Structures are given as C-alpha cells and as structure tokens.
Amino acid sequence: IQFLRTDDEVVLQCTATIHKEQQKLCLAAEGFGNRLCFLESTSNSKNVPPDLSICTFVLEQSLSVHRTLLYGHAILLRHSYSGMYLCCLSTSKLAFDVGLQEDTTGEACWWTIHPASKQRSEGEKVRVGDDLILVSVSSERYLHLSYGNSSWHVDAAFQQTLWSVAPISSGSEAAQGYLIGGDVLRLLHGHMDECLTVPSGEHGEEQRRTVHYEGGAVSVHARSLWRLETLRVAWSGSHIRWGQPFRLRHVTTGKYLSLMKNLLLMDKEKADVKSTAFAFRSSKEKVDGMGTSEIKYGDSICYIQHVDTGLWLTYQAVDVSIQRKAIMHHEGHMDDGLNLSRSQHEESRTARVIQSTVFLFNRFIRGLDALSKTIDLPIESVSLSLQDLIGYFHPPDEHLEHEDKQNRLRALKNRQNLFQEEGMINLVLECIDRLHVYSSAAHFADVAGREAGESWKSILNSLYELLAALIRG
C-alpha cells in the first residue's frame, strides 16, 4: 500500500466501453505540433505494444488550496514526452478542451484531487490505485471522459469521471546511474567503439529496418537511440533487473526490434511479445515498486537474450560489407558484452521530435501526391509543427546572460546536427517542391480547399525559415 509523492511519474486511467467491453484508457498527448490531450488504449499488449511514453505524467507540485499528495491539494502534471503541462484550455457548449501548455502561471495548469468515495477525506493521503476525481482550478470543471463522433475524447466538463492513478516510476527512489524502464539509451561494444543501430536516414523506410553495429559518429546521432519498454504498465519505470522481459523501440523510426531467424524492425501493429521480448543477462551461463537496482550504466556488461528462443543477440564477423550485422545465435561471441549508455535529455527529445516530424511530413507529402493524381492532408498540424520547429531552432535572444547564451548555442548545434544526420533538410526540400507545384494560394485552394489555400504561403514561408535554421552557422 503506497502513497503518491511529488516527482513521481504516473498514467491517468479511466474506464470506457468499447465493443460492449470495459477497457482502461490512458490520458495522452504529443505536444509536437499538437497540444490537445487524447486517449491511449492498453489493449492486446500480448500482440500490440502500448505507447506508454506519450501517456506519462510527472507529479511536479502539490500544495494546499518530495511531498506526499493529499486529497484537497492542487497538483501540477508535467507531461514527460513534451515537458509541457496538463491544463484546462480556453477553447472547445459548457466543456473546455484539455491539453498542454508551457506556461504554469495562472490557474489553468492546476488541478485539485478529490475523493471518489466517502472512503477518503480531504487532507488524507492519496493511495496508489485510489480512484481520483480531478477538478480544474481555473474553470471548476472535472477532468472528464466524453463520447463524440464514434470515439472517446478528454475534456473539462461539469460531469465527473473517475481516474485511477497507476504508478510508473518514483524519481525519489530511482538509483542514480542505473537502468530504469522507459529509458532512452545506446548499446555499445565499448572495446570496438561500436553501437547498435540501423542504416542512415538517406535510405528509405523499408531499407531502415535492418539492424547492425557501427563505429564512428553514429554514437552521437539520433539513429543509435533505443527506448527500453517493459511489458508491465504499473512500474514501467522501475529498475530493470536481470532476466526481466522488455521491448526495444528504435526511437527515430518508431519501430520495434523483432525476431522473425533474422532480426528485423517491425511496426507497432506487428510487434507481438514472442517475437519482440528480450532480456538482459549478466553472463551467458546456463514484483511491485521500484525494485532493487541491478544494471548500471557504463559499468555492467550486458548480454541480450531473446526470451521465447533463448538465443543471444550477437554480431556477424565481417567476412573477407563494412559493418557488423546484428544476428541471433545460441553461442555468440566472447566479446558480445554490451555496455549501456544513457541518452542525454536534449538528444533524446530531439530524436523524438524528429520521429514525429518525419511521420507528419510523410503524411503531408502523401496527401499532396494524392492531390496531383477522403485525402488525409493535415494542414493545421503541419502549420503548428512548423511553428514549434522554428521555435526549437530559435537563436538565443541577444539579451540573455553569457552561459545561458552559450548553452543555448551548444544545444542548437546538437539539434542542427541530429536533424541534418536524419535527412531532415531533404525532407523539408521535398515538402517545398510539392507545394511549388501550385502557381498560387488560389490554385492550391481550388484543389485542396479554402483552408489549405489560406495556409499555402505561410507553410511555405515556415518551410523556408526552418531550412535556413537547419543550415545556419
């Protein structure tokens, strides 16, 4: 029986009815070019990996109207995926939209926690697996589950929804330097200065599915980053222990490492447990809460094992083809030992930004191609993504202090490098080329609709500006 404390990470869950069956849905948001919260299912996990990373919130503050959450407290929920804050927005007749904003000033980002039943009282400690009611301080409406146009949405309304809080991680008891569920990391043969990765961003989607080890500069690039995702929901951010099963998500392409007898990255929808579950072992020799920390970054030598087969993740020596292909084998090599290395928050965020940008721009491009031959043409998301991307690359305002300026400048070079290495310049150029097929905003509108026509020039101007950001000194 555990209590919630600040700096704890949680998923907010509600129960809904789908195909006449109660399914538990999780509160989620992206925050890259979309601010609105939505709902993420945890169904069929034995066959479809859940996307827990967009659903995860950190309990940042908790006060009277690390500290234990009490009923009656106002709390501030930091979305882990974006660094933005759950808030009651002023858009939507009597409901408001719920989403993310940067600004924690004002009452909009604050939520009071209330008993679901007489079982709990104000000032009492919030227990893990207590069903909560959450009230917006700014609007006095409940965090609410609603039905509309054949789907479930989240809004702020004067009707109640019970939310359960599932604990993910507890930052106040996360041992420093140890592997934690949901970590973004690299996997290295340190002696070889090689890391586990996939072919570069100048190859197409189907060409980017194969996995190999590569030395040199990839060890600071986005394509060598992986997210480790455990099989459980509750305590998905607990310490990883030897032999505990997990999936490895390739961040920059979103695909999951899978065994067919070859290794291949597979779409979410194809990523079943038997083919995608691996574990760390400390050699190849024949619970609830954070748990005991066991696997140390930099220090532990780790062997990756496929669970259903027992086979070892290993390499194929180069025959007398430069790079060593990743393969599965019952013996492997005496120097198979992986050294784990934790991703910096910056490169980690940038890799996630790139993967959602690529996904959105690819939809945009496919929409444009369909126009020139029921079309999905996300003009609004494209426009907002481009505004966030241009902010992401904003040069430090000349008014900042020295080290504050130098740190932003260092961060900017890293973002530019990572984007460039993932082929983002050519992606931006391909969007420009497709929009340039049109003579004018009116030409585009005649074909794609008024709204599209009214964003043609502004999207183009943003693409040009982003391009300039992607190459400036």
Give the Cβ contact number of residue 294 at 10 Å. 17
Domains and CATH numbers, the chain: 1-170 (2.80.10.50), 171-343 (2.80.10.50), 344-473 (1.25.10.30)
> Which tokens go with 304?
């990756």
One-letter amino acid of 418: L
Cα dihedral sign, 261-266-271-273: positive
Q: How many Å apart are CA 40 and CA 54, to the nearest integer?
A: 8
The 8-class DSSP code of residue 47 comes to T
Q: What is the CA radius of gyration of the chain?
A: 23
Q: Is 312 helix (H, G, I), strand (E, B) or coil?
A: strand
Q: What is the dihedral of CA 229, 231, 235, 239, to 10 degrees?
A: -60
Sign of the dihedral defined by the CA atoms of residues 135, 139, 141, 145, in that order: negative
The amino acid at 2: Q
- Distance, in Å, from the CA atom of 285 to the CA atom of 63, rounded to the nearest integer, reads 51
Taking the C-alpha atoms of residue 244 and residue 282, their distance in angstroms, rounded to an integer, is: 12
The experimental method, as deposited, was: X-ray
CB 393 within 8 A of CB 466: yes
The amino acid sitting at 469 is A
Nearest to 228 by CA among 206, 247, 245: 247
d(CA 462, CA 435): 12
Residue with tokens 């920390």: 293
Give the resolution in Å: 2.2
Alpha carbon 88 to its chain centroid, in Å, reads 22
Q: How many CA atoms lie within 13 A of 144 on its CB side?
A: 20
Q: Which residue has the tokens 């790079």?
A: 323
Q: What is each CA distance from 24 to 12, 40, 143, in whole angstroms?
A: 10, 9, 16
Which 8-state DSSP code applies to residue 269? G
